[PDB]
Ligand code: BCL
Ligand code: BCL
Ligand code: BCL
Ligand SMILES: CC[C@H]1c2cc3[nH]c4c(c3C)C(=O)[C@H](C(=O)OC)c4c3nc(cc4[nH]c(cc(n2)[C@@H]1C)c(C(C)=O)c4C)[C@@H](C)[C@@H]3CCC(=O)OC/C=C(\C)CCC[C@@H](C)CCC[C@@H](C)CCCC(C)C
Ligand SMILES: CC[C@H]1c2cc3[nH]c4c(c3C)C(=O)[C@H](C(=O)OC)c4c3nc(cc4[nH]c(cc(n2)[C@@H]1C)c(C(C)=O)c4C)[C@@H](C)[C@@H]3CCC(=O)OC/C=C(\C)CCC[C@@H](C)CCC[C@@H](C)CCCC(C)C
Ligand SMILES: COC(C)(C)C(=O)C/C=C(\C)CC/C=C(\C)CC/C=C(\C)CCCC/C(C)=C/CC[C@@H](C)CC/C=C(\C)CCC=C(C)C
Ligand SMILES: CCCCCCCCCCCC[N+](C)(C)[O-]
Ligand SMILES: CCCCCCCCCCCC[N+](C)(C)[O-]
Ligand SMILES: CCCCCCCCCCCC[N+](C)(C)[O-]
Ligand SMILES: CCCCCCCCCCCC[N+](C)(C)[O-]
Ligand SMILES: CCCCCCCCCCCC[N+](C)(C)[O-]
Ligand SMILES: CCCCCCCCCCCC[N+](C)(C)[O-]
Ligand SMILES: [Fe+3]
């Protein structure tokens with residue numbers, strides 16, 4: 124058996140790396156955490172440091188408020204009984220206000236007032252985390268690709284929880300916090316809109332989601348196939364093409380008649396992925412606002 | 426016809442079958458025994474399909490469809506117009522795919538690289554063979570397989586899943602979906618990271634793999650590393666498809682009731698079954 | 707109807723995106739060439755993009771792509787046929803000549819630097835604080851080639867500082883000189899490192915490096931090149 128480079132045969136550790144400094148405020152980095160031989164068979168052994176900052180602590184606080192808001196309600200539902208709480212975990216659910224309360228904040232605390240509290244904290248937590256991805260790229264002089272990419276995820280989610288609910292006139296359209304119940308909302312949404320397989324955005328969403336799996340598999344496997352010539356050092360292959368970038372391009376050119384470049388592939392990648400939630404958020408947003416039935420619309424418009 | 430750097434690579438050797446017989450290119454395309462094998466199977470299958478277009482009286486991409494033999498025919502042959510075509514087309518598809526994979530191996534041998542690519546492709550091929558071959562056989566009939574046409578194969582997805590209620594509850598379909606999503610998240614992050622390092626703020630100098638580790642650390646307090654993330658992508662993806670196939674091969678065969686009902690094993694456990702309150706008491 | 711607009715709009719956005727993406731992927735190896743080195747007639751439907759310029763760090767300069775493409779090395783190969791699209795036979799020893807699966811690119815003859823401007827890759831001996839943290843430590847093991855003969859012995863691990871991973875094993879031959887072998891290309895066993903790509907006698911032809919505590923991009927390519935080429939070119943020297 125020749126060697127595959129899925130798992131390292133020998134790890135090496137030296138002094139903890141503290142990172143690059145550029146324009147970062149170093150008062151805000153933690154210090155390194157422990158070192159994980161386990162992780163190190165596959166990835167890097169070093170945990171931390173992490174950057175806190177005011178935004179990061181804002182964000183992290185809210186996301187726990189959101190998670191504890193949902194959790195106390197789950198204990199309520201279980202009648203504070205630890206054995207029930209376990210047994211029934213995927214069944215509990217924090218539901219939004221009924222249609223009648225519309226877009227208002229009046230809804231009793233127990234019938235959705237709590238849902239909004241949790242949602243409020245969620246909003247705060249996501250957007251501030253988004254400010255974070257941008258700021259940490261800025262401190263380092265790096266491009267804003269991560270923050271723009273993450274915005275495309277944020278799209279689908281804004282659409283589900285905030286925008287579509289607002290355009291339909293009620294919070295009851297929004298998604299509930301619960302394991303099985305959010306699965307049910309999803310099925311339900313499809314049935315009630317004449318089946319999402321008829322939504323042409325939904326289908327593009329799939330092409331892309333599936334696309335991501337095909338692509339990352341191509342790429343990951345390509346990079347591992349040429350890592351015997353240093354292929355994973357992608358930034359230096361960009362600056363100064365090696366026989367790794369060459370063998371890679373040519374594998375594809377010979378297989379399928381065109382290829383990428385070591386920089387280009389990363390552009391194929393960032394787009395394949397972000398279009399999943401891009402088209403998705405659109406597909407979802409049109410549903411019930413402009414189109415009541417995808418089958419139907421599918422019949423006049425094709 | 427050649428990339429600026431290509432010619433030093435276009436040497437003889439690496440073929441699996443044929444010696445030097447098909448050791449050449451057509452434009453960009455390497456051929457090989459298996460470039461020929463995949464052509465024959467591929468072109469046959471296309472013919473056999475355009476033939477199927479006649480025997481149902483449409484010449485239209487959105488309508489052309491080819492169904493397995495009906496459940497009645499068992500795991501045995503079938504008149505061309507009533508499911509035979511599909512059987513031979515499937516034979517063709519398999520031939521084309523596996524041939525495409527072994528051709529990929531031949532390109533590997535010539536280029537001095539690892540076999541990682543065709544190895545990954547064989548997962549996708551095994552998903553497909555799970556739908557049209559391994560599940561049908563375990564289920565007693567070709568008719569249980571999906572049909573080859575653009576909108577009609579979706580109909581089959583919907584019918585197959587609703588046979589078990591909301592298919593969401595298949596717990597291997599859950600694992601599956603987790604890998605697809607995770608993969609997508611990882612594909613966006615890698616992409617975006619490599620690019621934000623190669624394409625820094627205006628006028629600055631391109632960043633380095635250490636910046637890349639730094640950016641992650643700052644953000645979430647870990648970084649997998651540049652070997653790591655290519656190991657990861659490949660794992661998330663192959664795992665999505667592994668679980669995809671597993672969730673289907675167990676459906677209609679070891680479990681055939683309503684998937685949501687499988688989740689009762691947990692609820693009906695001695696140590697909490699009968700305590701009152703919650704959702705199930 | 708809004709949704710029909712949305713979707714028509716989107717098929718246009720996507721055809722544009724594919725154009726952008728395919729042109730961006732022509733910043734290397736284009737324009738296409740005939741087997742003889744001249745511009746090919748058929749360039750395909752996409753135009754070369756406007757060049758762009760990367761600012762290399764640590765004053766190593768810039769890179770502009772696309773730009774004038776050239777191999778910057780003799781290519782020891784010859785045609786085997788009288789028309790387009792056949793394989794090109796090696797004129798001499800393909801390992802030695804650096805062709806086929808033994809190809810190297812003429813990359814820069816400096817070593818890669820970390821973010822601090824230090825060498826990225828360094829033997830462990832010279833790497834402050836670095837030690838094997840797990841797995842069988844190879845330093846000390848005899849090295850066996852695909853012919854089942856002892857080619858040499860391991861005498862250090864060259865490691866990557868910024869990413870804390872092994873990159874080569876430095877190995878000592880019969881004569882007392884050393885060679886790099888890529889990590890990705892050896893198997894570390896309980897009582898030996900095994901090298902499937904190279905017969906023992908091919909070890910001495912591993913391309914040597916000039917400084918003995920640093921390796922350059924150009925030297926990595928030759929070493930990786932050479933060693934990968936053994937898969938194909940040793941193979942009449944092993945019924946393996
Ligand atoms: C995988 C689980 C289900 C399934 C569930 C769905 C669902 C759900 C959806 C699709 C959709 C698609 N599926 Mg399907 N599909 C299945 C199995 C297949 C198989 C197969 C095994 O051979 C094929 C070829 C396809 C092909 C397709 C495409 C027509 C479409 C977008 C695919 C995509 O982007 O993928 C990722 C791949 C790439 C990006 C690579 C590009 C692949 C190109 C686009 C494939 C073209 C094939 C062509 C139409 C068939 C011509 C055959 C020729 C005669 C040789 N499906 C099985 C049965 N499929 C979506 C759709 O919109 O359909 C209308 C959609 O919503
Ligand atoms: C029976 C149910 C319906 C159906 C109903 C729906 C509905 C409803 C929706 C989809 C959506 C999608 N469906 Mg569909 N779908 C069906 C059948 C399918 C089939 C199939 C049959 O094979 C497939 C392959 C798909 C595929 C898909 C996805 C491509 C698409 C969502 C992509 C995504 O990743 O969103 C996942 C990503 C997000 C939701 C964004 C997450 C980002 C946020 C910001 C992260 C917050 C994290 C939080 C703070 C917690 C952090 C904690 C951490 C531990 C640290 N559907 C059937 C027909 N489908 C979605 C879509 O876009 O449709 C057009 C959607 O809304
Ligand atoms: C109403 C429908 C049910 C449902 C019922 C099903 C059913 C039924 C199935 C799935 C399957 C899947 N579902 Mg489900 N699914 C539902 C809801 C969802 C939702 C969601 C967000 O709600 C999601 C995200 C998913 C996601 C998934 C995945 C786990 C899986 C699809 C990927 C795959 O298997 O690829 C595997 C990839 C392939 C088969 C492609 C192989 C490609 C071959 C090898 C080569 C093609 C060559 C081709 C001809 C092109 C030629 C060249 C061209 C020129 C390009 N389902 C709803 C509740 N789901 C499927 C599955 O798991 O299958 C194993 C499946 O059968
Ligand atoms: C573009 C499409 C894909 C995508 C992209 C994407 N996601 C992103 C990004 C991008 C580009 C980021 O930059 C951002 C990120 O930072 O990645 C590391 C992110 C991200 N995507 C995330 C999640 C996520 N993404 C999803 C999907 C997708 N994201 C799409 C597939 C999904 C799905 C499919 O549903 C999820 C759940 C986060 C990891 C991160 C955004 C983080 C955020 O907003 O955090 C705010 C919250 C907190 C600070 C705290 C909440 C934590 C609590 C759960 C406490 C834990 C309790 C503890 C005691 C232990 C228990 C552990 C677990 C069992 C819960
Ligand atoms: C395992 C992880 C993912 C994966 C990996 C993967 N796919 C791959 C590879 C890899 C590693 C390749 O190397 C190979 C390739 O060359 O990539 C461009 C490939 C490939 N995966 C492809 C498609 C594909 N992969 C998919 C999925 C996946 N592939 C997984 C998500 C899907 C999905 C999600 O649906 C599709 C549609 C092709 C681009 C390519 C294989 C091309 C090939 O094998 O060509 C030989 C055959 C032909 C040219 C055509 C012959 C067809 C005839 C036999 C008749 C038609 C058959 C019939 C079944 C049509 C059905 C149509 C309907 C369902 C609509
Ligand atoms: C162990 O016990 C303790 C107590 C420690 C626990 O804490 C346990 C906790 C739990 C068990 C909780 C578990 C939580 C879940 C299972 C959550 C499930 C949630 C999902 C699966 C998410 C599905 C989709 C969620 C979406 C789409 C949210 C979108 C929301 C946003 C768009 C927010 C919109 C904002 C609103 C409506 C309010 C804003 C109001 C303004 C005025 C701005
Ligand atoms: C000098 C400051 C001391 C900081 C103490 C060390 C904190 C450990 C950091 C944990 C890393 C975060 N992680 C891995 C959980 O994500
Ligand atoms: C992203 C987290 C992944 C965790 C990886 C843990 C995998 C350990 C497997 C190591 C290989 C076996 N070993 C060391 C005996 O060779
Ligand atoms: C950025 C990468 C581009 C890859 C494109 C994949 C296109 C697939 C087409 C699927 C058709 C779906 N539908 C229903 C909207 O017509
Ligand atoms: C001579 C150059 C070879 C170019 C190869 C181009 C392959 C494209 C194949 C067409 C199918 C693509 N798609 C997404 C529409 O399915
Ligand atoms: C076998 C090659 C053909 C596969 C083509 C698949 C992608 C089709 C693109 C659909 C174009 C959408 N629309 C509505 C503008 O026609
Ligand atoms: C679904 C995404 C895949 C789209 C494929 C794009 C086809 C590109 C073909 C370009 C051919 C370039 N060439 C060889 C002529 O130089
Ligand atoms: Fe990469």
Ligand code: NA
Nearest residue numbers: 151176177178
């Ligand atoms: Na601060």
Ligand code: NA
Nearest residue numbers: 830833835836
């Ligand atoms: Na040391």
